[PDB]
């Protein structure tokens, strides 16, 4: 239940994604778990809220992450690659321009098991999750943030 | 299928992080299934 970034594993074992524990709620991308219950040691985390269009899901409570990219500053992807320790990658986001407004986007292309890794602002707040995006050969991920 | 989680670290900014990646500006659409696509 400790705050932090977590691997999402399935069973040999394989890493299917990453998520964020904050304020007792686990946050990841819907396509990582498809809403399945999660084991945490001896305990079970049940889905609480999910949305396929946003590609997000929260466990044990409502979505808690609400910081947003300021549109100017560099950010850090806190990646948890399969088989490697958590590591930070700094970048200046580009922009997804949509009919409903702009979304920050990071032009970083890492293994699929990193989906759900948090993107951070300079204060260490999670401004969204990595792993839903488009191809331009290079993958570009939206900075996907939910609603608190 | 046992899906489970393992803690991997704190949520922190790292001062000495590697820096990379460009900053593209893209017109995209988001459909009902959550899939982004390019728009012209
Ligand atoms: O540099 C290398 N050196 C390699 C040397 C031999 C074989 C494979 C090699 C792969 C690489 C690239 N590794 C990237 C790293 O795994 C990572 C870092 C940040 C992040 F956000 C997500 C990530 F997956």
UniProtKB/Swiss-Prot annotation, chain A:
Active site feature: 31 (charge relay system), 55 (charge relay system), 115 (charge relay system)
Domain annotation Peptidase S7: ranges: 1-148
PTM: Acetylated by host KAT5. Acetylation modulates NS3 RNA-binding and unwinding activities and plays an important positive role for viral replication.
Lineage: superkingdom: Viruses
Compartments it resides in: Host cytoplasm; Host endoplasmic reticulum membrane
Membrane topology according to the record: Peripheral membrane protein
Complex and partners: Forms a heterodimer with NS2B. Interacts with NS4B. Interacts with unphosphorylated RNA-directed RNA polymerase NS5; this interaction stimulates RNA-directed RNA polymerase NS5 guanylyltransferase activity. Interacts with non-structural protein 2A. Interacts with host SHFL; this interaction promotes NS3 degradation via a lysosome-dependent pathway. Interacts with host CEP63; this interaction disorganizes the centrosome and inhibits host innate immune response.
Function: Displays three enzymatic activities: serine protease, NTPase and RNA helicase. NS3 serine protease, in association with NS2B, performs its autocleavage and cleaves the polyprotein at dibasic sites in the cytoplasm: C-prM, NS2A-NS2B, NS2B-NS3, NS3-NS4A, NS4A-2K and NS4B-NS5. NS3 RNA helicase binds RNA and unwinds dsRNA in the 3' to 5' direction. Leads to translation arrest when expressed ex vivo. Disrupts host centrosome organization in a CEP63-dependent manner to degrade host TBK1 and inhibits innate immune response. Inhibits the integrated stress response (ISR) in the infected cell.
Protein name per its UniProtKB record: Serine protease NS3
Taxonomic placement: Viruses, Riboviria, Orthornavirae, Kitrinoviricota, Flasuviricetes
Shown chain mapped onto the complete sequence: 1516 to 1668 of 3419
């Amino acid at each position: 239940t400790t705050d932090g970034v977590y691997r999402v594993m399935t069973r040999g074992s394989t890493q299917v994604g990453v998520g964020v524990m904050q304020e007792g709620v686990f946050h990841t991308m819907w396509h990582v778990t498809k809403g399945a219950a999660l084991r945490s040691g001896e305990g079970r985390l049940d889905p609480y809220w999910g949305d396929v269009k946003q590609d997000l899901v929260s466990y044990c409570g409502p979505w808690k992450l609400d910081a947003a990219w300021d549109g100017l500053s560099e950010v850090q992807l806190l990646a948890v690659p399969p088989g490697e320790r958590a590591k930070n990658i700094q970048t200046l986001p580009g922009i997804f321009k949509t009919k409903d407004g702009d979304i920050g986007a990071v032009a970083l292309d890492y293994p699929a098991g990193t989906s759900g890794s948090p993107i951070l602002d300079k204060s260490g707040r999670v401004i969204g999750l990595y792993g839903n995006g488009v191809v331009i050969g290079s993958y570009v991920s939206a900075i996907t943030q939910g609603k608190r | 299928v046992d899906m489970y989680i393992e803690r991997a670290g704190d949520i922190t900014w790292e001062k000495d992080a590697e820096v990379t990646g460009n900053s593209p500006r893209l017109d995209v659409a988001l459909d009902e299934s959550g899939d982004f696509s390019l728009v012209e």
